[PDB]
Design a protein around this nucleic acid. Structure first.
Ligand SMILES: Nc1ncnc2c1ncn2[C@@H]1O[C@H](COP(=O)(O)OP(=O)(O)O)[C@@H](O)[C@H]1O
Ligand SMILES: [Mg+2]
Length: 253
DNA sequence: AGGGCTGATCGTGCAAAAGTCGTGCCAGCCGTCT
């Protein structure tokens, strides 16, 4: 329920991912719009020997301070003013374990070439402490597929990405998943009802279930969660079965 | 019974005002030649 039940093909892929988890090889990952490819990564990291090691996942390419790539390894403060440099860094935080990337999609072509070169050769040096790169323990990249690079060539510098052919993982649509979708929805509903402290599950008309099934699920299980939330809030009661399920909060009446 | 406040610990720069040096150069004088 709170874990990744996953479809049958998704189950086989999950087995493959849990296996590749011990493989600390650098990776680039792809999940759907609202599939949630992160939880499988956490399950793998637990399955990886890097489970004990730190697994700092990239913070969506956040742009705090001017260190930027030197945010990967920087200094804290001059001794005369403040505190010691104390060797704190971003590329260093994921120490002894996994290292996950996020919001890799948003980048332009220049930083794309930079990342490609870092893959080719990586060094970490900071005014404050730091430690040698070229380790990148259990490295894995994610969220790049949200914005494709060089799809028709051009865009970001993904020619090297074509050259850099470390293994990748696709993402089938939720509509194409054909898993226990109603079961996952029920699990989410029960979790919400507990969170909502609801009297009980009011129920759902199987006709309502089939009607809600008439949807592309563009946000995948995230779309499922949002639609369930809207449908339940519309129900707002535990009395009678939900003959209504939320198509879209954007509408009129 | 409730608040405050405390300080364990927090080091290799450089700038501020100020001077001092570079450099010349103007006033006087006496050796001189007038
Ligand atoms: N098979 C699954 N097992 C557990 N949780 C899931 C599953 N599929 C989707 N989810 C949920 O969907 C949400 C998607 O969130 P997010 O990670 O932003 O999606 P994406 O990775 O597509 O951006 C996650 O919070 C996750 O809890
Ligand atoms: Mg996401």
């Amino acid at each position: 329920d709170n874990l990744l039940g996953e479809a049958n093909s998704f189950l086989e892929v999950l087995e493959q991912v849990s296996h590749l988890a011990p493989l600390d090889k650098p990776v680039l990952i792809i999940g759907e719009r609202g599939t949630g490819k992160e939880l499988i990564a956490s399950r793998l990291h637990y399955l990886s020997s890097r489970w004990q090691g730190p697994f700092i996942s990239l913070n969506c390419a956040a742009l705090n301070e001017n260190l930027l790539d030197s945010e990967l390894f920087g200094h804290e403060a001059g001794a005369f003013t403040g505190a010691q440099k104390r060797h704190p860094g971003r590329f260093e935080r994921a120490d002894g374990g996994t290292l996950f990337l996020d919001e890799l999609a948003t980048a332009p072509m220049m930083v794309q070439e930079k990342l490609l070169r870092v893959i080719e050769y990586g060094e970490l040096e900071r005014v404050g402490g730091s430690q040698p790169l070229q380790v990148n323990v259990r490295l894995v990249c994610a969220t790049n597929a949200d914005l494709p690079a060089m799809v028709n060539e051009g865009t970001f510098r993904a020619d090297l990405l074509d050259r850099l052919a470390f293994d990748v993982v696709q993402l089938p649509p939720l509509r194409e998943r054909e898993s226990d979708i109603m079961l996952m929805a029920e699990y989410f509903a029960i979790q919400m009802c507990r969170e909502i402290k609801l009297p009980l599950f009011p129920g759902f008309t199987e006709r309502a279930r089939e009607t809600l099934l008439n949807y592309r699920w563009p946000g995948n299980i995230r779309e499922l969660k949002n639609v369930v939330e809207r449908s339940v809030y519309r129900h707002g009661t535990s009395d009678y079965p939900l003959d209504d399920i939320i198509i879209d909060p954007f509408k009129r009446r």
